Design a protein around this ligand. Structure first.
Ligand code: CLA
Ligand code: CLA
Ligand code: CLA
Ligand code: CLA
Ligand code: CLA
Ligand code: CLA
Ligand code: CLA
Ligand code: CLA
Ligand SMILES: CCCCCCCCCCCCCCCC(=O)OC[C@H](COP(=O)(O)OC[C@@H](O)CO)OC(=O)CCCCCCCCCCCCCCC
Ligand SMILES: CC1=C(C/C=C(\C)CCC[C@H](C)CCC[C@H](C)CCCC(C)C)C(=O)c2ccccc2C1=O
Ligand code: SF4
Ligand code: SF4
Lengths: 742, 151, 42, 161, 80, 138, 60, 33
């Protein structure tokens, strides 16, 4: 049939011969080194499969097996986290007292005095405090003992072994053909209905059958050791039906569409659980069950061996209008022949999804006792923000790689891609103009407010006690969403999140969630965010659209995706490749995500996070300074950067001193990065000439001639150490501050 | 049915004929602007453009300037607008000095005499429009509070 | 021992990692059994 | 003593540093029950702190007014173990390392393809070389005096002046 | 305009002429090399200065040399 | 000579084409003959379809024309292309191939321009030729 | 100099100045640089052979 | 301050009239053929 299984048996013999021949994958590199450049080329282009061979089938097989290897590594990491939670953690003591026991799942050996890092985290335990949020996940899953964590680690190890065996089998023993990989409709049907749909259905099953009774017993105050085992919740229907009486009615209401009988364990309550500060687990169980139903329905859309189903090529070619020529014609061939286009799309979507995850997870805490765990919230927001930004820039990069390599103008005549290329100048000019407009009317407000406060004119500033820039649209949206329960969402007991408005949900005298008001400073920082995102879009889109040619270099596609320059001519053509545009866009992504996480940290510490005391007043961590200080750069410099760095620089002699060390070390490495960033290859090559003379004088010159790193490698090394330094500095500062004060 | 065509039936010039660029409305609006309208001396083009821009220049200076909360806010705003007008007239003067060689032709904007006439018209129109805006805001209380006088 | 596997084990990154870990283990065990050696003792 | 510094075994501020460290560890010890593994770990840390301060006080180290040991490195034998003798130990090892590396380079030039020897180490030959480094000063000096270490200037590449 | 010189170390491999994007160099008859040809630069007013010819030259330190000088519209690569 | 009446390849237009300096300072033209109607990539960005027979195209820079010539040479085996320079006054200056033979092939009558009769290491130091109009080559 | 001989380079601008190469061919015609010398070390451009005159090569 | 009118006279002149005329005349000089 048209969708079938085709496999070649034993295509590559399993041998250690090529393990002893570095550079075997590349005909240029298989000759062996002559310069040190060879080594860097060997480690830089190794998984760039399309540059080693022209056969798409072998490339796809390599991609499939490398994905299996990554899945094996991810399962090994998860098994490690479960095992280190099982053996080297305070998880039972945290289960007994969540509001007073700091989570810790890393213990150091005493060697050189580093045992001071095993801080007093409570529960009679000493270790390094962890902020990954695994304790709250395990509490949400119903894990009450470390034996279950040991079994989870064993399952993770078995799945890692299964994935690595599957990789070896599906590359080295039975490799699928190119026709097997080129089934987009079957892959979408199976991955929508089976991967997402059955996964959501089975997790809804686990939540309903295991998580809900155990968490209901935990919130009622039962100790974990007297809680029944999950299989007892499976087999004893009376034991479940004391907690959820609808289980006494069985599966008859499901098949007879009497679903409201199940309204006690499938709810749409919203808000947060007052005992734990997390989302109601019944709401999540209905949510994942509804997602399972929607995904399984969506997984029957696409045409297969049987006659039913949609054809995506027909869908794409049918959508065309008078403004767009041939429309979406030719994109199906692009996405079924070029892996780089798919990697671009999927990286862009995973980055946007990670950003959505960060926003929606701080605002609606889904796990018990994760809302008052302020380090966990800050850590997961910052981490997923950074992963999202990196994945978006990678989507742009691999879009540029598709544009340079796999784009064929003969198969792309007068379609959307051709017309986008044909008005690239209008796109880049209008985006450049709007970026300059955003830069002026966003950053000049901060500069203007700094000057006015410095000139002693407080009435001339942009503030709430001066000339106002009120965020009326976002406040109106907040009012609608606060008014949504009972008016536009009649079946909701509470709002989707209290950040739009409502009461102060507090757990253990610490604010789980409260309303987040928006003023002039929020207006200015959101338009700063819009400015930075538009400038990053300008850099990445300009690099993608001018990747093949420009008015400067008419044959840029012949030079490739990644080249340093086209010489000093035409005035200078330095950093003309799409790769250098990605190189600059990574810096601007760093700036954007840094400003976003700084806004997040300051706004939660000033207006949301804090302690509740008598008469219901909320004492915030920084005492509500965001409204009057975040309108100037001086306020950011003093009340956020200077003020909250006191914890990381006075951490010496305490358990957080490692963060201070890392703080200094990141400060070192970032500055070290500028040595690569500001300098050029010829200076270092001549200095290496002098060092080669010195080694020649003692007859100790190596056979592999040392060369300076390439111009592209100089840029990449400077960017990598720059990103590592900046992210590590923000990492140490954030973690030390939020562990100390929260 | 294609809505986007090569500009001027030349596919290799650096422009495209679009509904935003080359529709009947856009062509009528551009051909009826004083900078492109036929039958106008450069002096009258300058007069119309200066009247419009000098008229609208008064507003931001009056409403947002450092003297906006004082009784002389409109006078200060008009004087600041006049100073901006003088600066822009100096910009026009040096542009016309450096951009054109001295030719007999004086009926086009891109000639020395035509640009000097355009600069003269722009100055006179800018002063007249700024003075008209000053008169209107001085004599109408609705403009002094920008519409809060109705509340 | 397969000779190709031994030759792969003889590569610069593997031997570099093994030798630097071996050296680090010497320093770590020396500082574990003889800590706080600011000086050569007289 | 030297440079106005006092011996650490009679310095009152050295004792104040020791007392401050012991109290800082003991206040952490106070919050744990006796017999618990954190209590044993903290008591071991206290024992290491006391042993380190005792060992430092009886070693003839000189302490400044800060309360920390100060090293003397002018060449005097009364502090010869503070910089001179450990440095020679480094001088033993480092002169070893370069020499054996130099030896391997002289081996690697003689192979059929030198660069493969550069990236893929001949492990028995390298182990022979790292064994050879125990007599490196005399071997290196004999290599120097026989004209096999220094090469003349007319056989080395140089840039145009 | 940039200045392009060809020295008598040229071996007449024609690589620099093939690498030129602006048609600045051409091969002329010569007796100094075994190939019987030497590169020449009659059209240096079109030279942008990209030094692709210098990258293409296989003789140890280059036989073709580009010296950047006075910048013109052609040499600056301006389409405006 | 450049025939101005040669038909052009079918192109939908783009924003990458020639600016005002083409009609004011100088413009470039490339002609070539194709054995069939086929799609090529424009050097200014975009795809155009060249007709069977002769094709005339206008560009802003010589390098764009020679990039198109290299593209059609290595992708369509077309070597008969001719590149001309056109001024606003209407004078057409033939540019490539200058003597009809491609510059990588030796042709009789070509004279060497810029040839130096010694190696590059025999150039003079600046101190001989400071305050003097002598060239550094000798 | 002859075929197969090891020679040192006296050309100042050369990458292999005062280094040792092997003569690969001596051309007999009236060439300014008739001595092709092949080197074991590659240059910065990745080449390992060059032509030299008779006075730019000395037998070792 | 003796002759206190002189700062209020000269600072606007030196800071706005002098640079404007200098930029205008320098523009005219550097752009003329
Ligand atoms: C319903 C069937 C089904 C399912 C569940 C999957 C699942 C997956 N495919 Mg997939 N695929 C399918 C059919 C299916 N495929 C078909 C029919 C085709 C051919 C058109 C492909 C072609 C294809 C390609 C080309 C690629 C994938 C990849 C992936 C993985 C995405 C990464 C991820 O989220 O892992 C996390 C999700 C998990 C569920 C982790 C567990 C992993 C194992 C394998 C799940 C096994 C579940 C098992 C069937 C049921 C046992 C559960 C229980 C009863 C015990 C994921 C494991 C990508 C990949 O990484 O490949 C290695 C990839 O590149 N698929
Ligand atoms: C893939 C997911 C999954 C899995 C494996 C299970 C597994 C199970 N469910 Mg369950 N369930 C799920 C999802 C899932 N559920 C979801 C999403 C809902 C919400 C609609 C329910 C609602 C539900 C109810 C209401 C009941 C079960 C019951 C059962 C048990 C079957 C006994 C039986 O046949 O009684 C059939 C009983 C009849 C009267 C017929 C078994 C442990 C039954 C049980 O034993 O309770 C623990 C039971 O009464 N489930
Ligand atoms: C889904 C993820 C994914 C996948 C599968 C690929 C796959 C690929 N990319 Mg891509 N890319 C991605 C994400 C991804 N990328 C992202 C997110 C970015 C943005 C940063 C990029 C940016 C990017 C560029 C700019 C380029 C590629 C290239 C490539 C190709 C070759 C890569 C190679 O050989 O590297 C081999 C592996 C390495 C060199 C290892 C890199 C090690 C990093 C730099 C350091 C890690 C630091 C560590 C995390 C922290 C240590 C700190 C500690 C010491 C204290 C290959 C097709 C290149 C190419 O040739 O494409 C055709 C190319 O030019 N990609
Ligand atoms: C803080 C330092 C700084 C500043 C101010 C800028 C400013 C700018 N960069 Mg840049 N950049 C920087 C660091 C900086 N960059 C670094 C470190 C990198 C490293 C990779 C880059 C990489 C980079 C790229 C890759 C790109 C930019 C772009 C831009 C422009 C964006 C347009 C804009 O926002 O206009 C607003 C202007 C400002 C915010 C500057 C401050 C002006 C304020 C309003 C005060 C004005 C005062 C007034 C003029 C003074 C008059 C007094 C008189 C005497 C003169 C702008 C000129 C983009 C661009 O040009 O596209 C449009 C672009 O593509 N930059
Ligand atoms: C900055 C210059 C300088 C230099 C190069 C030296 C060098 C030396 N000092 Mg010295 N010294 C200095 C400044 C300096 N000192 C100052 C400023 C002071 C006053 C505080 C002293 C006080 C001082 C004392 C009190 C002594 C030295 C000694 C020594 C010698 C010990 C090394 C050794 O083992 O050789 C000796 C071994 C060999 C030559 C061969 C053995 C194999 C060495 C020659 C010691 C010594 O022996 O005096 C000569 C010694 O007792 N120094
Ligand atoms: C065989 C090892 C070896 C030896 C004997 C030398 C010898 C020398 N180097 Mg050199 N060097 C080497 C490797 C070596 N180099 C390597 C691998 C690098 C790259 C990191 C350098 C980078 C380097 C620089 C940048 C400089 C020197 C300088 C010098 C001179 C002064 C000594 C010095 O500063 O050492 C310091 C040595 C280092 C900082 C790097 C050493 C790296 C490791 C430790 C050595 C390699 C050991 C090797 C792996 C052993 C394998 C052998 C085994 C198989 C048997 C001297 C001629 C300096 C000079 O010109 O002074 C006149 C100078 O500025 N070297
Ligand atoms: C280089 C020396 C120098 C500097 C930096 C200043 C700086 C200043 N003077 Mg001052 N002044 C100077 C010399 C200087 N003075 C001398 C020598 C005299 C005596 C004639 C005066 C008489 C003077 C008066 C009467 C007043 C100032 C005022 C001021 C202030 C506003 C600027 C202004 O209106 O200038 C006006 C200055 C002048 C008209 C005199 C010209 C200054 C000297 C002669 C020229 C030096 C130029 C320099 C060497 C070359 C620069 C080349 C290039 C960098 C441009 C400012 C703090 C005003 C004030 O108090 O404001 C608070 C004010 O009213 N100055
Ligand atoms: C050292 C030079 C200098 C001086 C003397 C001033 C002086 C002044 N500035 Mg200022 N400014 C400067 C540099 C300077 N600025 C720079 C470098 C910037 C860029 C960052 C600014 C940006 C700036 C802003 C954004 C604003 C001022 C304003 C003001 C005024 C204060 C408010 C007031 O009472 O005026 C009331 C205003 C007036 C009385 C209007 C004065 C109009 C003048 C007299 C017309 C002259 C035109 C021209 C100079 C004629 C010659 C043309 C020739 C140069 C070609 C005051 C006149 C404020 C203001 O009121 O301006 C509207 C204001 O909003 N300045
Ligand atoms: C918002 C834009 C929007 O309304 O697009 C609507 C319009 C879509 O045109 P058509 O209806 O021809 O599109 C049919 C296909 O695009 C999809 O089937 O897009 C354009 O006119 C081109 C983009 C102009 C974008 C200007 C910026
Ligand atoms: C410093 C620097 C170099 C010099 C970097 C050298 C050539 C490479 C350094 C790599 C070392 C050898 C590996 C890691 C160093 C280890 C800490 C110790 C070396 C271990 C040896 C046994 C190899 C460049 O080549 C360069 C190129 C372009 C722009 C900027 C720069 C630049 O700033
Ligand atoms: S620099 Fe570029 S344009 Fe000039 S001669 Fe060399 S290759 Fe041709
Ligand atoms: S590339 Fe060098 S060697 Fe070859 S013809 Fe040109 S100048 Fe001569």
């Amino acid at each position: 049939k048209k969708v079938s299984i085709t496999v070649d048996r034993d295509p590559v013999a399993t041998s250690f011969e090529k393990w002893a021949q570095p550079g075997h994958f590349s005909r240029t590199l298989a000759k062996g080194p002559k310069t040190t450049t060879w080594i860097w080329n060997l480690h830089a282009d190794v998984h760039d499969f399309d540059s080693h061979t022209n056969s798409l089938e072998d490339i796809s097989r390599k991609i499939f097996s490398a994905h299996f290897g990554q899945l094996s590594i991810i399962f090994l990491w998860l098994s490690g986290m479960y095992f280190h939670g099982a053996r080297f953690s305070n998880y039972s003591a945290w289960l007994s007292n969540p509001t007073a026991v700091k989570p810790s799942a890393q213990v150091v050996w005493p060697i050189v005095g580093q045992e001071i890092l095993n801080g007093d985290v409570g529960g009679g335990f000493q270790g390094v405090q962890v902020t990954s949020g695994f304790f709250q996940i395990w509490r949400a899953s119903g894990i009450t003992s470390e034996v279950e964590l040991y079994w989870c680690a064993l399952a993770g190890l078995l799945m890692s072994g299964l994935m690595i065996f599957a990789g070896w089998f599906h590359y080295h023993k039975a490799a699928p053909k190119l026709e097997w990989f080129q089934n987009a409709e079957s892959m979408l049907n199976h991955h929508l209905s089976g991967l997402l749909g059955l996964g959501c259905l089975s997790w809804a099953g686990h939540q309903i059958h295991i998580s809900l009774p155990v968490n209901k017993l935990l919130d009622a105050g039962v100790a974990p050791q007297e809680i029944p085992l999950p299989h007892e919740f499976l087999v004893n229907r009376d034991l479940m039906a004391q907690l959820y009486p609808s289980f006494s009615k069985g599966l008859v209401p499901f098949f007879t569409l009497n679903w409201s009988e199940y309204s006690d364990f499938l709810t749409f309550k919203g808000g947060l659980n007052p005992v734990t500060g997390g989302l109601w687990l019944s709401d999540t169980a209905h949510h994942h069950l509804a997602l399972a139903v929607l995904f399984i329905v969506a997984g029957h859309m696409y045409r297969t061996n049987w006659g039913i189903g949609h054809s995506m090529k027909e869908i794409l070619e049918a959508h065309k209008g008078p403004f767009t020529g041939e429309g979406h014609k030719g994109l199906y061939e692009i996405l079924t022949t070029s892996w780089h286009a798919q990697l671009a799309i999927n990286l862009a979507m995973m980055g946007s999804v990670s950003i959505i995850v960060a926003h929606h997870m701080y605002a609606m805490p889904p796990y018990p006792y994760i809302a008052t765990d302020y380090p966990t919230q800050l850590s997961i927001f910052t981490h997923h923000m950074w992963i999202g930004g990196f994945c978006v820039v990678g989507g742009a990069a691999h879009a540029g790689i598709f544009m340079v390599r796999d784009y064929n103008p003969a198969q792309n005549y007068n379609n959307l891609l051709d017309r986008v290329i044909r008005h690239r100048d209008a796109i880049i000019s209008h985006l450049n103009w709007i970026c300059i407009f955003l830069g002026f009317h966003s950053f000049g407000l901060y500069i203007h407010n700094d000057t006015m406060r410095a000139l002693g004119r407080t009435q001339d500033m942009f503030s709430d006690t001066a000339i106002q820039l009120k965020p009326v649209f976002a406040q109106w949206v907040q009012s609608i969403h606060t008014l949504a329960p009972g008016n536009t969402t009649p079946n909701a007991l509470a709002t989707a999140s209290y950040a739009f408005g409502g009461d102060v949900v507090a757990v253990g005298n610490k604010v789980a969630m409260m309303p987040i008001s928006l003023g002039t400073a929020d207006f200015m920082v959101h338009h700063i965010h819009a400015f930075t995102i538009h400038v990053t879009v300008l850099i990445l889109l300009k690099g993608v659209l001018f990747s093949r040619n420009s008015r400067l270099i008419p044959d840029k596609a012949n030079l490739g995706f990644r080249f340093p320059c086209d010489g000093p001519g035409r005035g200078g053509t330095c950093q003309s490749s799409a790769w250098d545009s990605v190189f600059l866009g990574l810096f601007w992504m760093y700036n954007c995500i840094s400003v976003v996480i700084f806004h997040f940290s300051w706004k939660m510490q000033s207006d949301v996070w804090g302690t509740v005391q008598a008469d219901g007043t909320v004492t915030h961590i920084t005492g509500g300074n965001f409204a009057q200080s975040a309108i100037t750069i001086n306020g950011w410099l003093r009340d956020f950067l200077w003020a909250q760095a006191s914890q990381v620089i006075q951490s010496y002699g305490s358990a957080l001193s490692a963060y201070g060390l890392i703080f200094l070390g990141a400060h070192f490495i970032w500055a070290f990065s500028l040595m690569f960033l500001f300098s050029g290859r010829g200076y270092w090559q001549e200095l290496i000439e002098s060092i080669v003379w010195a080694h020649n004088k003692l007859n100790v010159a190596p056979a592999i001639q040392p060369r300076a790193l390439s111009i592209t490698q100089g840029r990449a090394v400077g960017l990598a150490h720059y990103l590592l330094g900046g992210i590590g500095t923000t990492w140490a500062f954030f973690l030390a501050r939020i562990i100390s004060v929260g | 049915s294609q809505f986007i065509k090569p500009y001027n039936d030349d596919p290799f010039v650096g422009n495209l004929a679009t509904p935003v660029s080359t529709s009947s409305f856009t062509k009528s609006l551009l051909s009826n602007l004083p900078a492109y309208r036929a039958g106008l001396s450069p002096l009258l083009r300058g007069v119309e453009i200066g009247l419009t821009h000098g008229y609208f220049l008064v507003g931001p200076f009056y409403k947002l300037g450092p003297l906006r909360n004082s009784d002389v806010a409109l006078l200060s705003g008009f004087f600041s607008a006049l100073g901006l007008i003088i600066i822009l007239v100096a910009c026009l003067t040096i542009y016309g000095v450096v951009s054109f060689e001295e030719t007999e032709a004086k009926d086009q904007l891109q000639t020395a005499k035509g640009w000097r006439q355009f600069t003269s018209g722009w100055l006179v129109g800018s002063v007249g429009g700024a003075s008209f805006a000053y008169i209107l805001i001085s004599n109408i209380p609705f403009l002094q509070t920008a519409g809060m006088s109705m509340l | 021992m397969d000779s190709n596997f031994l030759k792969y084990l003889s590569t610069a990154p593997v031997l570099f990692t093994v030798w630097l870990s071996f050296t680090a283990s010497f320093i770590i065990e020396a500082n574990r059994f003889f800590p706080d050696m600011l000086y050569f003792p007289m | 003593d030297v440079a106005g510094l006092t011996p650490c075994g009679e310095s009152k501020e050295f004792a104040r540093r020791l007392d401050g460290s012991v109290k800082k560890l003991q206040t952490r010890l106070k919050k744990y029950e006796a017999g618990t593994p954190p209590a044993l770990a903290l008591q071991k840390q206290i024992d290491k702190t006391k042993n380190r301060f005792d060992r430092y006080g009886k070693a003839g180290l000189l302490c400044g007014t800060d309360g920390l040991p100060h090293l003397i490195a002018d060449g005097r034998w009364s502090h010869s173990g503070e910089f001179v003798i450990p440095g020679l130990f480094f001088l033993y090892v480092a002169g070893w390392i370069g020499w054996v590396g130099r030896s391997y380079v002289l081996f690697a030039r003689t192979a059929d393809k030198p660069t493969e020897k550069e990236i893929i180490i001949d492990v028995p030959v390298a182990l022979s070389f790292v064994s050879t480094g125990f007599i490196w000063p005399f071997s290196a000096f004999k290599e120097f005096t026989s004209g096999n270490l220094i090469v003349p200037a007319d056989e080395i590449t140089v840039s145009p002046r | 305009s940039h200045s392009v010189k060809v020295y008598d170390t040229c071996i007449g491999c024609t690589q620099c002429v093939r690498a030129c994007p602006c048609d600045v160099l051409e091969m002329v008859s010569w007796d100094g090399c075994k190939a019987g040809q030497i590169a020449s630069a009659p059209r240096t007013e079109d030279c942008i200065g990209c030094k692709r010819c210098e990258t293409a030259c296989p003789t140890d330190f280059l036989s073709v040399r580009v010296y950047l000088g006075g910048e013109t519209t052609r040499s600056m690569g301006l389409a405006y | 000579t450049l025939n101005l009446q040669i038909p052009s390849p079918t192109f939908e237009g783009s924003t990458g084409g020639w600016l005002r300096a083409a009609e004011v300072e100088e413009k470039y033209a490339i002609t070539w003959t194709s054995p069939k109607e086929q799609v090529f990539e424009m050097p200014t960005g975009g795809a155009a379809i060249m007709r069977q027979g002769e094709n005339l195209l206008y560009l802003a820079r010589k390098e764009q024309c020679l990039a198109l010539a290299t593209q059609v040479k290595n992708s369509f085996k077309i070597t008969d292309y001719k590149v001309y320079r056109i001024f606003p006054s209407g004078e057409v200056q033939y540019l490539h191939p200058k003597d009809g033979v491609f510059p990588e092939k030796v042709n009789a009558g070509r004279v060497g321009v810029g040839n130096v009769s010694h190696s590059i290491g025999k150039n003079l130091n600046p101190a001989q030729i400071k305050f003097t109009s002598k060239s550094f080559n000798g | 100099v002859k075929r197969g001989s090891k020679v040192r380079i006296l050309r100042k601008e050369s990458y292999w100045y005062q280094d040792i190469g092997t003569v690969a061919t001596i051309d007999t015609s009236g060439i300014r640089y008739p001595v092709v010398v092949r080197f074991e070390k590659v240059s910065y451009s990745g080449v390992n052979t060059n032509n030299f005159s008779l006075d730019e090569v000395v037998e070792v | 301050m003796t002759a206190a009118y002189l700062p209020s006279i000269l600072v606007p002149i030196i800071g706005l009239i002098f640079p404007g005329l200098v930029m205008a005349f320098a523009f005219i000089y550097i752009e003329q053929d």
